[PDB]
């Protein structure tokens, strides 16, 4: 397949701990482990990692096809990182980072300050731009999408919290 | 010459100084002073009797620059400049009015031969016969 024609090359600076089904990757700034399913046959062969679908679970081409895409992201996420910037377009809406906490100037009668978990070093260059930094590809989206779900992109003004690369489709009033 | 940034050939009869804003967005693409394209071409526009759409192309550059290529008016409007009316295509294969022979077509092709490297003489001759049949025009020599 395309995934079978896709092996991943681990570089120096990220150590694997192959206890069979449980792999804990000792990396640069974290520990990106995934306890996969038993539809995989893993082997860090020489340097480039090779994998395999186990018999019986012949649908493990899917279940390890996740894994081939997975561990490639893990060895490049623990070292380099993800810049996940969000664009705050709100009338009187600010963003400021302190410790691991983000403020949410969100047009309410009360402030919303939610604490953010490990795997996050957040920053804020201004009141409308907010950095998020992380090692797992999941955690760099999950903490980002929760903020965006508190104020979705409003398609009559362009109001809302929105990603850096995301482009909304704002409409027009057309009646009054 | 250039690539995916910008390349559109649109200019109509140069007696109108104003950029005619079904053409204006081709001047509204990469930040021109519209007075510059009015002052570029008028030094040579006083060598013509105006009335035909003359074409130019636009082509762009990095900072605020631009460029343009001057050619001669096309033979498609030269078919309907001599024929009197500017629009004859009402029924292509059901109208038989109006004759011009090949000799007129090549002398409006030498001004293409003295201007451009494509639109060659003998190859356009059937398409200057092809713009005649769609308009409902006849040709004999």
């Amino acid at each position: 397949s395309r995934v079978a024609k896709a092996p991943v090359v681990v570089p120096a600076g990220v150590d694997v701990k192959i206890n069979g089904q449980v792999i804990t990757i000792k990396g640069k700034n974290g520990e990106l482990t995934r306890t996969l399913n038993d539809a995989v046959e893993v082997k860090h062969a020489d340097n480039t990692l090779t994998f395999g679908p186990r018999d019986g679970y012949a649908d493990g081409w899917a279940q390890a096809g996740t894994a081939r895409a997975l561990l490639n992201s893990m060895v490049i996420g623990v070292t380099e990182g993800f810049t996940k910037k969000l664009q705050l377009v709100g009338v009187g809406y600010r963003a400021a980072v302190k410790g691991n906490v983000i403020n949410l100037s969100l047009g309410f009668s009360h402030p919303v300050d939610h604490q953010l978990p490990a795997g996050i070093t957040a920053e804020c260059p201004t009141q409308t731009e907010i950095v998020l930094k992380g090692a797992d590809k999941q955690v760099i989206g999950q903490v980002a999408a929760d903020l965006r779900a508190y104020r979705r992109p409003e398609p009559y003004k362009g109001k809302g919290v929105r990603y850096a690369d995301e482009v909304v489709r704002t409409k027009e009033a057309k009646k009054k | 010459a250039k690539k995916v940034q910008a390349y559109v050939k649109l200019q109509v009869a140069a007696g109108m100084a104003n950029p005619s804003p079904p053409v204006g967005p081709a001047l509204g693409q990469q930040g021109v002073n519209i007075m510059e394209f009015c002052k570029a071409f008028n030094a040579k526009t006083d060598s013509i009797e105006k009335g035909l759409p003359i074409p130019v192309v636009i082509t762009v550059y990095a900072d605020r620059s631009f460029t343009f290529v001057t050619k001669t008016p096309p033979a498609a409007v030269l078919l309907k400049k001599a024929a009197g009316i500017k629009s004859g295509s009402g029924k292509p294969n059901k109208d038989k009015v109006g004759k011009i022979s090949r000799a007129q077509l090549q002398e409006i092709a030498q001004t293409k031969a003295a201007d451009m490297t494509g639109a060659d003489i003998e190859a356009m001759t059937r398409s200057i016969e092809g713009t005649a049949r769609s308009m409902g025009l006849v040709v004999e020599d």
Binding site: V91, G92, Y93, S105 | -
Partner: protein, 279 residues
């Protein structure tokens, strides 16, 4: 200026982009818009305390606070620029280093209001009682008086053009103008007119010399914008109700005969939207 998104320095530096003017502001901002307590007057370099309760009480002036000791530095040096390029005489003491006091700089900038190249800006709150007591002292020093301006300039009645600056004092023929001419079910027609100079007594043959009509001057009444207070003797500069005008138009003169005469109606509008009322 007690609201979110209310940046003072943005808006005054937005005029230089959209309106294209030259504003140099004076009274700056102290406070993060909710704990806002000080308005930074920059000539005298003094912040003003405002009320906490008892809706209007204090006017307590102090120094520049320590949390804005450098933004007051970089903005005062642009204030004292604004007289070297207003008058040519302050050009050589911006660079020589003669002291640019509070009293010296306004003598140039007041003459920068008769040409109107700079406007004077002030941040504060009307409703939170933060700035209103501050805003009054600039009016006597940056807004022009009826005796400091070019006064009534009647030209003639007919013929050539000789524009004549008349006197702003009480020593002239009388002159006024007719505007804001409201109505009432007591006397009928009313006015909100303003006299520019001269004194009128009670009872006069005030004409309207642009449309050739004779009127007589009744019982003039002043207001608190609402309440009838009968103003008998109208001094030069009051605003009152030139009552009992038989016919009066937009902006004609209110003037005794054998005197200068205005004839001026500029920019007569056009009410555009037309709806048809039916009984």
């Amino acid at each position: 200026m007690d609201r979110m998104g209310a940046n003072f320095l943005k808006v005054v530096n937005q005029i230089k982009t959209r309106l294209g003017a030259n504003p140099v502001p004076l009274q700056l901002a102290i406070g993060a818009e909710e704990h806002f307590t000080g308005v930074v007057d920059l000539v005298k370099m003094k912040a003003i305390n405002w009320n906490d309760a008892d809706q209007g009480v204090t006017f307590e002036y102090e120094d520049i606070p320590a949390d804005m000791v450098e933004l007051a530095n970089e903005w005062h040096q642009n204030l004292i620029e604004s007289a070297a390029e207003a008058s040519e005489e302050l050009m050589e003491k911006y660079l020589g280093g003669e002291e640019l006091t509070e009293a010296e700089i306004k003598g140039a900038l007041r003459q920068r209001v008769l040409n109107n190249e700079i406007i004077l800006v002030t941040c504060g709150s009307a409703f939170k009682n933060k700035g209103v007591q501050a805003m009054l002292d600039a009016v006597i020093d940056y807004l022009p008086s009826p005796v400091d301006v070019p006064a009534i300039n009647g030209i003639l009645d007919d013929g050539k053009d000789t524009p004549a600056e008349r006197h702003a004092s009480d020593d002239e023929p009388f002159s006024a103008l007719a505007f804001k001419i409201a109505t009432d079910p007591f006397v009928g027609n009313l006015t909100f007119f303003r006299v520019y100079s001269g004194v009128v007594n009670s009872g006069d043959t005030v004409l309207n010399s642009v449309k050739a009509a004779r009127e007589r001057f009744g019982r003039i009444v002043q207001m608190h914008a609402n309440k009838r207070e009968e103003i008998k003797e109208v001094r030069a500069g009051d605003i009152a109700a030139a009552i009992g005008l038989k016919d009066v138009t937009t902006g004609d003169t209110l003037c005794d005969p054998d005197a200068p005469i205005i004839l001026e109606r500029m920019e007569f509008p056009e009410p555009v939207i037309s709806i048809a009322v039916e009984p």
